[PDB]
Amino acid sequence: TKTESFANLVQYIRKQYSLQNINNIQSLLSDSSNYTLDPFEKTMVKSILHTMDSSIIPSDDELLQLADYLFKVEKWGYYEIILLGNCVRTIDYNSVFLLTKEMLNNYNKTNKRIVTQLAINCLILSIDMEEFTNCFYLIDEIKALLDNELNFYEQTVFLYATGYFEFKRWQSTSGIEKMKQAIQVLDILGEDNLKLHYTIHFDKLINN
């Protein structure tokens, strides 16, 4: 089937992202590799690379067509959820929040975790853009998605996102502790190439 190779592609991308191995993700685009991606996956790969290197933006036509195709589908499955969650930083926020709100109104074990990640990404993006009425809703939905589920990775990144939201809105000394506890959880479990991504963010937040 088709949705069996897309999962392997996403897992390969996320494993090369953890090792910080650029130039191996930037080799699926070139016309010599195993994975040949349809123009909706090339856009997702370019959007993922854009987070590691700010000069690999997708074109405006690609994003226009991706948003047009997203606003048309009605059965949101394993494909559209990933395409949207991995392009939160390029698609305009106004159209990201609408789709994330519609996804949380369509209420499996592998799909709850794939919706939790999209919700957390939308929450981080909404904290960046300073939309605070759109953040309480996301926090209230996410803390109900993570209810009695043993997803410690999503729970850790959501702890960090909650600390971020609390430091942004009120500038209080109680979001700092949540961010530092998330960093502690990353440091105890031995995630060395993942603790750095959050330590750099914390350092550029607190120091200005």
Binding site: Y17, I82, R89
Partner: peptide
């Protein structure tokens, strides 16, 4: 960045 790669 601090966003998680959805799907992996």
């Amino acid at each position: 960045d601090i966003i998680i790669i959805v799907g992996g």
